[PDB]
Structure 1
Amino acid sequence: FSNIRENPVTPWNPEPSAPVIDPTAYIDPQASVIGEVTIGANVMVSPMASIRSDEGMPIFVGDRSNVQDGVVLHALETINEEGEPIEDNIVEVDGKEYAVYIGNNVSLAHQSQVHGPAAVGDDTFIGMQAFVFKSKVGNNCVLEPRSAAIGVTIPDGRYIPAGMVVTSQAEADKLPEVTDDYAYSHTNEAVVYVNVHLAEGYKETS
């Protein structure tokens, strides 16, 4: 069996698609990547990650991002019964439509999940075991371990404290800002540096 595969034919998917993966990205043998997915350069996809673009599609992962162990990417149906695009389940980023958009230099840490409709802006850290669903996470954000964003827009440069589940726009509007002395202020840039080097080291083993 192959771990990089096309999505299945369904009522909302007449013409199956295979993943478009940059030659510089590293896909672990025990990761799964199915369907209408774009993976950018220098991306690392670790063991036990599941990127499944078979319901809502497409799922994009930008350059120099990382999808760590056990992370799941999936999305709600983007096409309805009559083939009507379900606009509530589609996210717009730079004039293009996605089910799930992961930007560039984004870290999806171990066991996190980003479920469409969703977008995660550049240089954001999504902490261990964190959750993003029906939300837009701006750039330069930090979701601490076990935090969650559901049904909201997290403004650029804010963080979500560990364990906090943000479900209302009033709460996301009052999230704290990332500053230099904040404990996770330098975490994402270190993580992206490490992970781009791991992708290249792992590529040299395949």
Structure 2
Amino acid sequence: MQEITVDEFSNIRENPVTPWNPEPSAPVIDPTAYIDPEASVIGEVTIGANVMVSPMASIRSDEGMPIFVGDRSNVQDGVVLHALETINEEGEPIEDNIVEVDGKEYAVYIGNNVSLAHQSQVHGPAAVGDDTFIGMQAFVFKSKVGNNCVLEPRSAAIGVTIPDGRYIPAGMVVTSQAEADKLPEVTDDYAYSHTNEAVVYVNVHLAEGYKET
């Protein structure tokens, strides 16, 4: 006779053992967060309250760790998070690939009320301040996006530091500090000036709603 045992979250796995990762860690997920069954969370990850991780998302902390997703933020469909090796095989920090936020080191840091829209990708080292909207298909790698910024659909920041309150126009691929520093300011009449607030609201409500059903 058979006896079946079911794991309801085989998609929320843990870290594998590698020369740089001898002891597997597993995602720490706040109870209020909603991880879609078809999303994938692996390794040293920390998801906060009310985070809404949509289908096909892939948060994978197995090379560079850890990845942090703040409260009220959201990881939409297709979004991918990953980072470059933060530790070598001798247990030595690979400083170049580590970002620091408030005295804590991270391979990827997503603050609070941050929107990683459909298809965007953020790759460590990286940091994205609170209330920032990473638009559809955007890309952020080896950069530091400040607070209240807005990367419109298709923009990309690579190896630069976006100051707070700036926005990168659709399709613009920023790769020099000179350019970053000249980015436009988010004003009250800027089209995406309020997009984040709305997206956040919707997603936060989607999280709990999806939690019953």
Fold agreement, TM-score > 0.5: yes
Secondary structure at the counterpart of residue 208 of structure 2? helix
TM-score by length of 1: 0.98
Separation in structure 2 between the aligned mates of residue 63 and residue 4 of structure 1, nearest angstrom:
19
Alignment correspondent of 1:179: 187
SS in 1 for 2:157: strand
Mean alpha-carbon deviation: is it higher for 73-82 or for 122-131? Answer: 73-82
Structure 2's unaligned 5+ residue stretches are 1-8
Gaps of 5+ in 1: none
Tell me, yes or no, if structure 1 residue 53 matches structure 2 residue 89. no
Alignment RMSD: 0.7
C-alpha distance in 1 between matches for 2:32 and 2:89: 38
Give deviations 1:35-89, integer Å, cap 9, x for gaps.
0000000000000000000000000000000000000000000012422100110
- For the residues of structure 2 that align with 1:110 and 1:161, how far apart are their CA atoms? 17
2:207 to 171, 184, 199: 199
Distance 2:125 2:206 in 1: 29
CA drift of 1:100 comes to 0.3
Distance 1:25 1:123 in 2: 18
Aligned to 1:5, the other structure's residue is in SS state coil
Paired with 2:196 and 2:23, the residues of 1 have a C-alpha distance of: 37
User: 2:42 maps to which residue?
Assistant: 34
Structure 1 residue ranges, 4+ long, deviating more than 3 angstroms after superposition:
none
Number of aligned pairs?
A: 205
Using the alignment, how far apart are the partners of 1:148 and 1:188 within structure 2? Answer: 18
Counterpart among 126, 129, 133 of residue 134 in structure 2: 126
- For normalisation by structure 2, the TM-score amounts to 0.95
> How far 1:110 sits from its partner (Å)?
0.2
How many Å apart are 1:24 and its aligned residue? Answer: 0.3
* Cα distance in structure 1, aligned partners of 2:146 and 2:203: 21
- Say whether 1:7 aligns with 2:15: yes
Match of 1:17 in 2: 25
Separation of aligned partners in 2, 1:191 and 1:200: 15
CA shift for structure 1 position 201: 0.2
Q: Superposition pairs for residues 81-160 of structure 1, below 5 Å?
A: 81-160=89-168
Kindly state the Cα deviation for residue 101 of structure 1 after the two structures are TM-superposed.
0.1
Q: Partners in 2 of 1:105 and 1:122 — Cα distance?
A: 6
Q: CA deviation at 1:204?
A: 1.1
CA distance in 2, matches of 1:43, 1:122: 13
Q: Percent identity?
A: 100
Indicate the SS of the match to 2:112. coil
Give 1:90 shift. 0.3
Aligned-residue offset at 1:95: 0.8
